[model samples]
Target chain A: RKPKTGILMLNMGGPETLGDVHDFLLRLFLDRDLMTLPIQNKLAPFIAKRRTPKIQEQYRRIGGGSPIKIWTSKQGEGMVKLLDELSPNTAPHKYYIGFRYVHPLTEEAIEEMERDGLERAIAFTQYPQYSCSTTGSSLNAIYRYYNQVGRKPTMKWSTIDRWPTHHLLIQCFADHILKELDHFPLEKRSEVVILFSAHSLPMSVVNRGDPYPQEVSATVQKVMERLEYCNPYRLVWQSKVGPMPWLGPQTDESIKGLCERGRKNILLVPIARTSDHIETLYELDIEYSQVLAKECGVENIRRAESLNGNPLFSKALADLVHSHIQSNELCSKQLTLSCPLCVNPVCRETKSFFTSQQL
Target chain B: RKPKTGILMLNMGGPETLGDVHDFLLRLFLDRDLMTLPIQNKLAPFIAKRRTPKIQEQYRRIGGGSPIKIWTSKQGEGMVKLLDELSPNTAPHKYYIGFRYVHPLTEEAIEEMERDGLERAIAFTQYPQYSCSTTGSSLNAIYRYYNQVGRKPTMKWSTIDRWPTHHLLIQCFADHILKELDHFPLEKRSEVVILFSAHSLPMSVVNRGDPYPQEVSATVQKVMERLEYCNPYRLVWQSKVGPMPWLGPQTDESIKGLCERGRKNILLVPIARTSDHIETLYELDIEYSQVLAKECGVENIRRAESLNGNPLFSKALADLVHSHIQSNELCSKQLTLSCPLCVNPVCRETKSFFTSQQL
Candidate 1:
């Protein structure tokens, strides 16, 4: 016996330990979406081999490795509990965690769900804020998986594209900041400020008028409004890679300027992270916490916790899933067609008669 | 009005941004203590530029930069407060954070102290664990700086070489791990494993019998013991930069083996980090966090809070300083006896009976 419905959650998976570092790098670099290269297999292996030594050292310091799989596991567990509570009698829901890059790969997930005999399916992904690169790639993977086998009945399938304004998400971030804020000296709270740090995207993407920047900004704005107390805050960008110009007023530079301008006691609120990854662990919490307070003459600095299994954040996912089952909605953004700003042809391509669309 | 004394906290510094990457690298490689290259200054530039692209990417991905100066600033402030409380009547204290690689360079710090009309100085570095190549070189720089002007009086100078077993330091780490462990569901906390991540030292340093390895191990041993709950743990080396062989049981390999053997929910406690810098911020927090959990099916990894400005940790520094002043003891280890294991002539040779010693 299987659940009446199945929810396949997709994400870009990561390596488990130093042993997997080279493999993970190869997978990422070979991905046409991440790296545009020729003879990718050969080139990817060379690059992966060269990069392995350095990244291995990095993994060592971060307490051994990444946990995208672990978080995904908990996320799957949490969502199942929520579905059981919210729509228990309506449908027994089963969940499968799938990754685009590593173990439990997309094809493997589809095969698992098929074997389970789930009567209905929902291709649910938390890339709620954007579709092209994130869920876009994952969607393409699933389409290939299903077609290579056989398409799931439309009545049994659904897709979620955008969630730029999740109320529970906003609450989750606000509460994280609020709890961190309490650590500051009560009388010195006047000097406390917030930094809403978001991951940077290439100018190429921004130039294409990607909605991510605006969407992230709107999400940040609402999160700020939800905060119980008003304090000076600004949005910043981080994790910019390569020589290409990226989003402005970078996190480090912004914190430096904030210090120069005499704002002390900063509380870094990760604007986009749903779970703890390198971005959250390395960038906001450990990395920035050091220099920001040190350089800024700030007395205290803190980071909001990642929202991986936070109840409110999960509640939002539960609510979204419930709504999708009741009505036919693709996404809050209604991105059924190819995204106008997405430059990936892979995302735009379609198998006619509406049998398959990548993104 | 000048204070009766100044505390010159010295250590190697780092680049603050992608722009400073090459320059800092040049300074580091040319230094006799770190790397003794032929045609040093002249040859160092070419090597620095050649390595810049790779390293700038390193510095960039880690977090936009290294905030050694900023971290030093806070450490200095914290020390200043401690001295004020510990020996307020003996001397109104002042602090100058001196960096070997970057600004506020050693000379600049000394010049500032001179301008401030301070009558005495204590060349105390909290890089308490490492010796010879690290503190040894720092001592030489201070000696050169003093000789370049004119040697200050005995009443005005002191050197501290080692502080391996700080009670408060151990407690600070244990408490931090305990607090982070509190976040996990109590029933699952037993699964937690600890990684005592310490920076790697080249075999060149070990060849000289540099005591860094033993001291770091000792620190890890005590800190692990301090934790209220005992879980299996091990110490590992990180931040290996060059082709040369360094310390063993490297972090990535250790964690990989741990996971392969089924250790999950690892808590990384940085045995050496007193405040934020590249190792903690980028290496452990961001870079490694990507792989360990993602590939290994291990999740729930967390790092002990950045040791910067943690009241208890600062209190440890304060107490350490107080003990140093009251005992008329320089290093707790008193390395001037030429180290039981070290072979560095620089540490061995003395200009006189005591005027010029490594400690």
Candidate 2:
């Protein structure tokens, strides 16, 4: 019952180069999780096509495409290595990294896992933090995947929904920050303004008492106390994708306030990002770094590298897998609601079967 | 005699929020850049308003607003600082960032320079690679701004036409890619496919021998040989905008074909882009990743990071400026090639000049 196992990793996949920008937008807008897309699918593709040039130009500047899968695969590699070493000895374990909206989709991955004869599948949330948008949406994909798999009884599935203050993740961020600390002169190191930024959520998500902000705060507290690094720190949200007010004081606001207040030496720790994908690579490193130097007038700004296949992160993932099998606390099916009762109101599955959706 | 220097940082500015997206679009579409633009300016506002909500929805997904100002401001700041450091001893150097459509527009920048009593100026382009639509239109805006400002003569000016493969840019891309190579596993690192892509130009442009596509490919060709690691690579056009055929073997078709042909690992480099923006952040990261993993069955696609704020990039830009001023070349007026002569074949200046004034 416990053996023929599969652990499927879920993520918001990224484009590898500039051309896929259009397709990516198509899929994203098509997905119900993020955009309500005023016009229905018929009209959406035209709009996506219209927007592609401007969007494509953006990618052209940022080394062409997304490194999300690359990072995730490295993550999967570490997971597989550990899963092999720490998996149940009675049977064997296979690892699958799946995307909710992209390639290596949940549907394909599950189909492959089923072909691999893995009847016991554990859906693991790569997003350590939760947003009904991320974890809930991902679980919805799995649900839909299984829904399409015939009569809805393909395999046994459970999940690891969200770990606000995942132990290994906290330390992974801490270790990265600690190493980055060495980059600054020791005299000014402690003076570094540790901007702990999480990918922002809508003020709306937290309004529903989603607990993401609280959890993020808890992680920040956990990280600082664990490291005992009392360096000046403030928690801020980064990459607020929409205008409807994300949980703030936003990164720019906080940074500018800090800069104006004479906290010139700043080190950004993008806690929300687990890997060196677009958020960290472009938003934090490239985009925000310019803001620091020009807008804030700070000459020195450094970003704490994301946890991309860090040994400690891998070590923790090992622990996650080790404890997850026996602990049936958070499985995708076991812990998540069906589309009918999904937490995220915007989920495609959650939408009533009959009504026309409007933006 | 004293304040006789202003280096104007020119760009196509962006709307900072969902509210601003409309005006940004209005400026772009009305600017004679893309369409034969039937109905022209009098009718452009109507279409722009209609398109705004949809475009705004896209912006809502990619972090509330554009980072255009932040990046452009950073460029201007750095330029000003450098100008101050490298100025003629008697002249007070100033740098003014001007956008074609958005705020801090060409008119204001020129006006500011006039106020600062600058007589000699250089309209330095932030765009290293050029398409007539982007740079040419920007120059048209400058000309129009002067038109509005009483056919003003604020300062003596010059320009720097497209730097297809500026040594600084080429080396900067090469360095970013080289550092990124370490992310791939040793066994597959050398074998990783470097999908070098550029923003696709309309086939219309290439048909007219615009030289954009050739120059884009030239940048790719130069950067590839320079890299110490000879990863198997291909230069493809990406981010093709409209209904018009832009370039061949777009990145998606190439990636899928590669996947179909059994080439797996891919590293994407957007040669056309110089900074991190929506294309890099949302399109490449969000869109392409999905295509690579879901559509093509690609498991590992890593993107080379943009050279947004790389110190090397700043150094190279500075060097470029140093050389540019010395050469005193490619002035915007000197480059008075109208859209009739433009690759796009609808240069507003040329069109209006013949129709309204005659060349």
Candidate 3:
């Protein structure tokens, strides 16, 4: 039987296994919408080939693969279970993860959705704050899928574009930060500095008027507000690659700076991200926490838990979707408008298709 | 019988009587959303009182008052007549005007809408390209009215946010320009400079990432493309009130510049405005054409007719609204997003209410 509703969570998926690393890297590199590279098709393969082994090793350190799929699936399943309870009119909700750059990709998700014969669906973005690179890229893939099939999908769709300061979302992040702070000695807990690290966008994207930075900052501010300013906080950027400058202060540089300033008692909270992956498991945990913190003479730099399979996060997700459906919004008004400097035809067409969908 | 649909045309209404000019100016000045003046409550009245006679004289020069209401009503009435025939399923369409600055204001329109018991309504923007000051302010008024009444309107509301580059709109504009070019000597018609003048926006608004400039340029470009660049054209600005730097090469400055460059054969096209008011009948015809052009040693300068009461423009309006209804789009995706530097709570709240409306 067809599900009463489907929540197709959109994300940039990571390699789930060593065997998939090269292909994942290749796909990621080839997405000019996500990141521009010279001669992308040619350079992407060469880069992926050279970096595949190193990336595979990182995944190996994190239990042989990215746990993104597992965490995302758990979160989606948990959110939908609560969504069915919270909004009974849109009951019997089934969750589907539509990732970019890996297996169970957006197109594959669309195929399964068609087979399941979902008449109503929500293209619920897994990204909290929208960037053309992340959520925009995923939604574009959905557009490409329908266009490739030579018709609009039978299912009606609405999107959850961005929720930077949704109260529950802020609460979830604040809760994680507060919990992590408990690890610090009570006498010095108040002195612990909170650094909100999110994946950095290329400066090009930031200058192009992408809402990501402003949105991520809003999330951080809201989270701090929830914490009642229990500790000093600074929002930082991380995981930047290539020669291009990205939005900063870079997370590692911040850690180093804090240590030099004798404020090494830092609590790093990943704000933009929704789940653990290479971003958290390998990059934040291993690279920053293990390698960089040690190098910076920081003994008390503790990273907060990501909202991976967190019950509170799942409830926030459910509440977000529940209100989205009840409000009868096809998409946020901001979704209809693009960055002032936007030029991607794919972005335009994707938005048009989604906005035009009848539900 | 209940009308099949209501086309609620949104606009910044002008005073229909000299007696009303002060109140019109007062209301216009009082709207902080539309324009910010120092000590607005006190200053607006003083400014209105002082400027009343001068504005009254200008109105006297043009049949004693503004004709925007008549022209808008005529356009809306004409469009719906065609819409009723074009889409019989939504036949028996009625038209309503929601003016921001004068009688039959947005709240008044809402009251009439409730009285008529409209089941479905299209908030069609008369401004071809959206601006926060014009279209945004009018929409905010609708939101304020709904809020003041303590509930959502019973009728379903969908909006036509912007149609800057619709082919038919371009065609209508191109047609007007071509017709005006006929008045130029055949030998110099091709060289007659086409100055596409739009209402000037403040530099402050432009810097804030308002889509108006880009959207107006798109309309100008599409119109020129339709003309196959038959005449060299430049987009310029007009009707800037204060000393604040508005989007320019002011229209008159361009005319003077053209005359000085020995390219006096000019065709001025008002691309942004949908109807003639003081902007066209006075600013273009008298101030610029009669006064400025006369002093500049020009005899061939001509202004293209406004879209008011034009069958082609009415047809374009009808097609735009028809497609909007058929696409099942409640509002354009761009409507969901705002200018990157936006700070107006009214704008944010209005967009939320409109996006949340259920049909």
Candidate 4:
């Protein structure tokens, strides 16, 4: 019997460029399934109808569009190339890219995999750290699709929900930080403060005990230890949704305070993020950095390189995926599937869509 | 005439305790207004009916419920006390706490303020950074309420949409970091890297030039400078939503990398957040910290204290609101009203309801 093999890389798709911002936001906001606005019932269409132009303008400022979809495609391309190199025997592992909300949807990816005739597959989200909101949602979507179709794959199925501490990935983050530090004079290098910024969520989600925050902290510690630099650093939350309480110690305020206190050199290591997506491209690299440079009178504001198909990082991911496949135990398999006891549990009972099926 | 004033502190309400987890998740997931699932038209009910029980159990494990609402109430109570001390004659400024999606809704808070007959008010979201998804959405909700009722107050409103760097607030955060550090030995203290972890957002939001991640980095820089610690530190993102491409260098992954490289003493500071809500209570404090300390072989995993009722933080907020009120700028005066520039500039152009409203 031949070993069936397939590879699927999951991601949240975005408009390829600034031109796609209007439609992208529309797709994001108009989808009651993504934002779930009550006013959406009466107001979603109204707002989407009214808001496109200005959003496009904002996108215009940030290199004229979102490069996320394009970036993901690139990542998928790189992963496919690497996987083929690593598992030469696996019948030319077909690669499928799936997005949760938009084009190239999960169902389409699944169909592609089926068509490739690769029954055994390794399904993974691009994110290294797992959260129900990101990886969990995609996984659930895939599972639901499988359950709905009533056609379980005959070949072995595996998943890589998260790789909280991939070494090469960590080195990649450290390298970015070191590279950013070079922007400052050697004397000021030690004075540089490092910041790892992550996105925000409602406190309710955390109260339910999601491991998202802890997982993030773990990665930060890993990177810091690897570099062994003694510069003060901190973590913060950003881009929170709704007015409801979110995790705190907001980033902007932190920067202003640092500038006021005469900390001229600042290095930002966005450990929670990987690519030069919007958060890095505009928020960190442009807007906030500009604000600090001008408004706060800070001398230097630099960001580390984001993980964008870096050869080392990609190779690390390949190794991580390979190791998971070799570990045949249910416990090890559960690591990829989001078990309750895993060090980095992806699914939280509080927010899981598969509660009924869990028993 | 006596000066009339009130200070309303907006917050994201959390589940009162574990029992409310099911309801909380239901509210978060089932609400077409929040998650906006494609299957929302049908899946909302399906998810609500199925996922609630399991979520309830998860909450039960973490002290049986969330204390966010209660904690927020305490913050309100603390702020009132602090305000009384700071300005005794300022119309006994009432501190009204409003939750965007749950009980004690904005309308309730507004009604209370209206009944009090206050003519001048300072309105602001609890979040430090400004984003359409958060502060923007809450303020929009308030504006819609006023627009709907046609009972707009002769309001002289001042809004603090985002305060990336607040000196006093950074000091307060630093104080907490020091306190958490007390548990470790002096040598280990320097060895510990301050990991400033913030919540994560989708890259798409960032590309549109949301100031969230930048704001978080700025805050982290400020805290580090004020603390005067020279240690390798980092900023990371956590708790992302949906499968959309979120900002990266996720927290847990960073921590694991740190541990792998022997960075044992790790201090987790949530610079982007303020309260001891769920992210701090569960993700960082309980789950992530435990994972780091136990699983990852990291000896010290400490979390900085949250600014729940800290007088300094509350005072900083008070100071911000007071400044906004004093500035009397167009941006400040249109506190409750959404400005095309401040709200969704893109939405204004596209005239799309779904697209236009988010800030």
Candidate 5:
């Protein structure tokens, strides 16, 4: 049998530090290909210049930088290093880092793959939840490049787009959450409320049939089962934009509701996020932490550790990749692959001027 | 002196029912201006068509449709009627509904204003907080239209982009929260953790000096001050998008932390949101509620009533509009506007591709 492929990691890139803010914003805003603008000639640069500086300051306050790119790179390197040690016969799999918006673009990854003459690869998005906007968008971008080049390499594309109930991932979360529980008084643990939050998208997206909420719920259920804590927890969405409706339970609101009814201790688990990036760093650590501790008078509030450089998480990624290559199945036997051609039916209508051209 | 202008309510549009899901996603994805992707001929529709069906199903699960559009429209009409009763000489100020991504575009509002022969106008986003992406983008889009049409019309554009510590808003929130507390046993109220949540954004946006998180904090502080309830409370950001770093305290994690610490009753106040949308409905009510009540094992969790069609919120909107139009100041006394030409020095940079192109 052909040697199994190594590993590929993908992530959305961010500035390394506060100083990289402008360039980072510029890269994010200037991607007409990613944004799909009709008037990129005028609009792309226009928006980038206007927006970069302000975005920089946000990162500055939250540890003065975003560790996404660095962390993602580290993850890639770590995965590759570990894969070599564990599965040496897999032809020393090469690890490639693909960023959706910034440096090391997906096309570059494809170029590198072609150059390395690697065949039979598994394409996976860093996100554990399946959403057209995130995983779908990344996959589409890569597929577009492949189609443009018309190079149908002898590759079996196995995408681990969403793993809401992955055993390893759930175990990792359960362990971390339980560990955090050690900080609180044992009696208080039973009284605490576990808030499970994921990132939010417009309700419009959900209205259009995004399986994000369901997948998220499944993860919550599975994780809770693994922990067997029997504590109260809820799933919510965060970080919405624009005037469009977004899916939510809205974490902050839920927290406030809990406080009003007299729940004092809180544990925040950003189940949607696997790493400690801006959301975990600033929003949770500083912003919400301050709110609960100072304003709400909650005695204890802690964020469950993100699966950033966690060895277990890294191992899980390796295992997932291995399973993808070795299994006869085209996709992960442990995970389900959404139909490639699938589009949410509701998204087809309600044409906004923003997306008018496509409609 | 021109009489104080009537209230101009701003709100996010929502799909009226499940049937509208397809069009909603189509519009959202088609907005090249919003998504900003390269126009590769068939690329736009191909993606949009592919993504619609899944989106529709998501909507179907969430009460069969979005109540936003109809609810918001009702709110707008109600506000207008109330405003008319309060300020009859305000020249029948119209309530124009501008969907950022859909029909009744901002330009259409301008056209409507022109048709109404109204020369002076004040702009206000429905969102209470100030965020560059949400209110900022809406303002930018509206201003872009005005500049593009070269129809300044002597329109004295005054805006109440944010009111972090609005007394009435806080009071209204307090009232709603207090009502939710009725469900919990009285003894539990004092120990309840009031989880105050606002929407989450990319940390990059905050790093870029958006001042959104600060604004949210300020509002929470004021609410706490006004309510004077010593009960434990916490502030958090929720609904962040995955695959990207975002601001956080992540409501879910906080809840779990609280659960571990032995707090039982919980109340949530969605300070940022004024209406019932998916974030509040499915994410909070059906989804998070079940998650917390079933999986986490908390005794009780409830969300405060949203500002949807609330008399106080309506009155607040009315008062804000009155204040904006009546004040002769070039900039509204109630809110601060960022300099159009210069980005804030403290702003952090990100990988957004549209940062550079600002007028």
Candidate 6:
């Protein structure tokens, strides 16, 4: 159906099947702007070539491919359904998912937008905090696809990129933590150490002046403030790869260390991650909670649930987008300035292009 | 020295020492915008609370914290140094690192800009591809900080946020690949499979419609084209988190599969990542090549180096920025549009603000 407005959700994509893994990784490895590796041309293929089996096994254990697509579809559908109710002016809202490195790529999404021939469209980032590596990377990809397929000047466009501290978002996180804490004995729940694990970025990335760590911290602070500091908690890094230093302490090691220090009863929370994927299921669940904790001689290890298929989170998505439509702002003032250490020329060109848009 | 132009680098910052791990993780978990977690308010604190110790240990292993700052500093300094030579009109280009999650926050970067009272400033995203999740998120944070400190209508502001397939960027990747291919026996190098490994995103994010995968693929295609398809290659994903489906044919498993298929000689490239960080040092060199390869019964597993402190890469940064200044475009056309499935209010507001900029 023709819609009044289109809400485009942007995110880094994943493979839905074991067969898709190779191509997925191949694409990921080739992006020099996303992350520079030595001899990336040759090396990316090597790594992607060799790493396929185990990852497929993990996916297999997790009941086939990731549920992110299903969940995101539900979330997208749910948000638009609510948007229609909240803003009749922008009624008949249609949703689109633009994955960065997988199927339904931004190109496809843009095609849909073009085919829909909507008069208005919204570019929304799924990530809460704005990080050049995550949100920024996705934005650049969007720019490429838009340019690749030719611009739709006729479509009045808008974006929704910032929301790390949304109230409802915090509420959602708080709700899950509350539920997880219930799993522990009441007397010890208060004392049980809470571990917030986020995907770790390289220290080099940190030094490069990315906003993720700070924003992640901001989210943690707000969450804790919301919780009123109910338990002693720490935000830690997880899913670190390679040898370069990343934001830490590592999640697995955190569990091991906590057990060693007699802080066995711990609740591991997946912060900086919206859904239950490899990190939550395998890393946090089996690797950290089941394996690492047991190896550390502790049995009481728990993990908070991810914000997937949550009605509140879905509602938050809708409310945020709706507010954006109402605000009529092109983008944040900060979007006008390139990162202080930015070296990529695309950053300069893409920013110029975005700022040039009249609507 | 007072500079005529300021180039601000945007990124997610990291902790410098083990002592900083707790606070670092705390900040990361608190950001609702970055990612949403269940009971994030409570979960973020709990996770950050418990995960600090292990991350600190990692920092200890890696000679304390991340060196992203140091490298970024060098890159920034070098780019400006070269910019002076490349474009005399914008000869004096100063660079700043605005970390999103750590020290030298966007606020501080702005404070410095204000202190300089510069007439012109450029927000350059370090990320090559524009992802709403990464560059968009960072751009939004910049907008937040700019708003927090009051807008500088007097100061001219511009941005740079696209560059996944720059010629120089492709050249850099190709050069690195050439260097790594030398390690293999001349007779076997062509047959050796090259794996390009990058960080994985969730299927949900893919379904959300991020431009990363497509853009990354574009980059790989460009690089391979530049290399004239010297070796058998495949792009793969690494550093996947949670149980959600991530772009895969995972790095480790790829190696396992390669070996099982009797293709032993392999080169793992860290394509999505630029610097020599944990993903490269530990994951690729140690975990994948050493441990995983051994487990796969492969004797020859090599990894390409990371693009750290490469003069060519540095030059590429300068040229890109210089061209951006020469072009004087506000931003890419894509930046003006929010992702189709976007639900974040900030994306709308931020884009509105950027497009509103007259400079």
Structural similarity to truth (TM-score) of each candidate: 0.48, 0.47, 0.52, 0.48, 0.47, 0.51
Misplaced by over 4 Å in model 5 are A1-6, A23-40, A85-89, A150-156, A291-293, A332-359, B1-359
What is the docking quality class of candidate 1?
incorrect
Reference contact recovery of candidate 3: 0.00
lDDT of 1 by residue, B1-359 (tens): 45777888888777888998887878887777566788887888899889999878878877778866776677677767877878876468877877787777777887887777776667777675765666667776766676667765344566655555578887877888789888876876876777778887765554333546546655665565466226645566688876866655466665655565555577787877677777877778776766655677766677888677677766776677677677675443234333323333455432132344333
Q: What are the runs in model 3 whose C-alpha is more than 4 Å off?
A: A1-359
Q: What does the i-RMS of model 1 come to? A: 24.6
Q: Which 10 successive residues of model 5 chain A have the least lDDT summed? A: A350-359
Ten contiguous residues with the weakest lDDT in model 6 chain A: A333-342
Clash count of each predicted structure:
16, 28, 8, 142, 191, 234
The DockQ for candidate 3, computed on C-alphas, is: 0.02
Better of 4 and 5 by lDDT: 4
What does candidate 2's lDDT look like per residue over B264-342, in tens digits? Answer: 7778887777777676666666677664546878767877888776766766666666676665544422133222123
In candidate 4, which residue ranges exceed 4 Å CA deviation? A1-359, B1-3, B26-34, B39-42, B82-89, B330-359
Our tally of clashes for model 6 stands at 234
- Candidate 3 colliding pairs, count: 8
Q: Rank the candidates by lDDT, best first.
A: 3, 6, 1, 2, 4, 5
- Name the better of 4 and 6 by TM-score: 6
Which of the numbered candidates is closest to the native, going by highest TM-score? Answer: 3
The 10-residue segment with the lowest total lDDT in model 1 chain B = B349-358
Root-mean-square deviation (CA) per prediction? 21.4, 23.1, 18.4, 19.0, 23.0, 22.0
lDDT of 5 by residue, B1-359 (tens): 33334233455466666566556666666654345567734565677567667656656767676776676676777666666776666756667766665556666775666666554555667777766666655656665675578764434445556665567788888888878877788878766778776777764454333435545655665565567535546566577655965554566655655565455577878878778777777666666667755577888888898877778776777776666556543332112313111143221111111122221
